[PDB]
């Protein structure tokens, strides 16, 4: 098990408030965030903000699947953003899929996290994305590729906190037993320790 090549770039676009492109290997996702701004009166809430997440694929038009994976991303960012400090305003997250090579949701979560961090939004704790794919026998592989995803009998994706490494989001494909669910959760907890180091080194370099 070994995470593949990682790269990231910040402040690409001049129009939004914060931009961050996160590509992990061959797959890539671009994201941008507009800071706290005005909100339609029919959707505003007092003592809280409103999070809006929309996802755009590269081929075709969004359907039921993209909104079902938009709820997860919105309900994951909702648990780490201190909205009470900014009521009667709106926070929006937009995700664009540039290339797909496998484990897209984890790269989308990392793109969203780096865009929120770049945009200067009050946050309670950072979050990560780790995807596991155990093969037809039980050999765990971390950060797989669509070649291995096609052959694998089960694919799992987790979102992990940056404080005590708890579980925030979980979407699973395939059938399995609980023992290897525990061992892939432990592998995810072991994997996030390097992504958070990549986060810290990137922001330490930014303020050089």
């Amino acid at each position: 098990c070994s995470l593949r090549h990682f790269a990231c770039e910040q402040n690409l676009l001049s129009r939004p408030d914060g931009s961050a492109s996160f590509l992990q290997g061959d797959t890539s996702v671009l994201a941008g965030v507009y800071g706290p701004a005005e909100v339609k009166v029919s959707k505003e809430i007092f003592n809280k903000a409103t999070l809006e997440v929309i996802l755009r694929p590269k081929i075709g038009l969004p359907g039921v699947a993209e909104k079902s994976r938009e709820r997860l991303i919105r309900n994951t960012c909702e648990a780490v953003v201190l909205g009470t400090l900014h009521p009667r305003t709106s926070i929006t997250v937009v995700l664009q899929v540039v290339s797909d090579a496998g484990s897209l949701l984890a790269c989308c979560l990392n793109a969203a996290c780096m865009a929120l961090v770049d945009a200067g939004v009050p946050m309670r704790a950072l979050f990560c994305g780790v995807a596991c794919a155990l093969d037809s026998d039980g050999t765990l592989v971390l950060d797989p590729t669509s070649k291995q995803e096609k052959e694998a009998r089960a694919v799992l994706t987790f979102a992990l906190d940056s404080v005590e490494r708890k579980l925030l989001m979980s979407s699973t494909k395939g059938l399995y037993s609980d023992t290897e669910l525990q061992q892939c959760l432990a592998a995810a907890q072991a994997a996030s320790q390097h992504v958070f180091r990549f986060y810290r080194e990137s922001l330490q370099r930014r303020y050089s």
Binding site: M123, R124, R200, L203, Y207
Partner: protein, 237 residues
């Protein structure tokens, strides 16, 4: 869990905690910090800074400074805004936040029910806030504390208004900043800064106003000495 007074000038991350000195103190946490129990929590990236003037008293505030574009109104700031409407007997002005501000016809110098001031739609005004809490639309007055407008009101007749990030504004408004003196050595200039991320410039030639507009947005970066003098010489032309 590190302690304060030790990680000054160090890049921090959201979710980290730090220990203020021991005997709870009444030091108020700043923008990117929130006080929980007898510890401080970090909610914004940036760099820890502590400012106590000259004495062994308080004398001291904890605030991180980061780079961002979206502006949140703060009470007592000089903010440049642009008029949008003239509804009722007020002047709604766009400052760059979530909601527009609100002037009054008598807020200007020597304004009464008869000698109202001429304010159109789509004009830029220099003025400071007096109420900026998160409970109402912000409201700004535009002359002075005493009542003599010290350069405030409607400004700008033959200049160029551009927009920069909050970092460059913070960097320029420093007592040990030599940016303006050296930049004005080449091209004579006059500036009116705004804490919402806007700058008004007026050089002599339109060409010089274009050059100053382009070369001022890059002074937050491109560190001085080995780079700034050579850079100034190349642009001298």
């Amino acid at each position: 869990a590190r302690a304060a007074r030790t990680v000054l000038g160090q890049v921090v991350l959201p979710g980290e905690e730090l220990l203020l000195p021991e005997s709870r103190v009444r030091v108020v946490c700043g923008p990117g910090l929130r006080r929980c129990g007898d510890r401080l929590l970090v909610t914004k990236c940036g760099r820890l800074r502590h400012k106590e003037p000259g004495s062994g008293s308080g004398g001291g505030v904890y605030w991180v400074d980061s780079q961002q574009k979206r502006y949140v109104p703060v009470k007592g700031d000089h903010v440049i805004g642009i008029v949008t409407a003239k509804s009722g007997d007020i002047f709604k002005v766009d400052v760059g936040g979530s909601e527009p501000a609100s002037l009054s016809y008598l807020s200007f110098e020597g304004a009464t029910k008869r000698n109202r001031p001429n304010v159109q739609v789509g004009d830029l005004i220099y003025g400071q806030f007096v109420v900026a809490n998160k409970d109402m639309e912000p409201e700004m007055v535009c002359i002075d504390s005493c009542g003599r407008a010290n350069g405030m009101g409607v400004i700008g007749q033959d200049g160029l208004l551009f927009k920069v990030t909050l970092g460059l504004i913070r960097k320029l408004l420093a007592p040990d900043c030599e940016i303006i003196q050296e930049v004005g050595k080449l091209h004579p200039l006059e500036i009116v800064f705004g804490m919402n991320g806007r700058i008004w410039v007026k050089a002599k030639t339109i060409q010089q106003t274009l050059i100053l507009a382009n070369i001022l947005e890059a002074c937050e970066h491109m560190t001085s000495d080995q780079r700034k003098q050579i850079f100034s010489r190349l642009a001298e032309s």
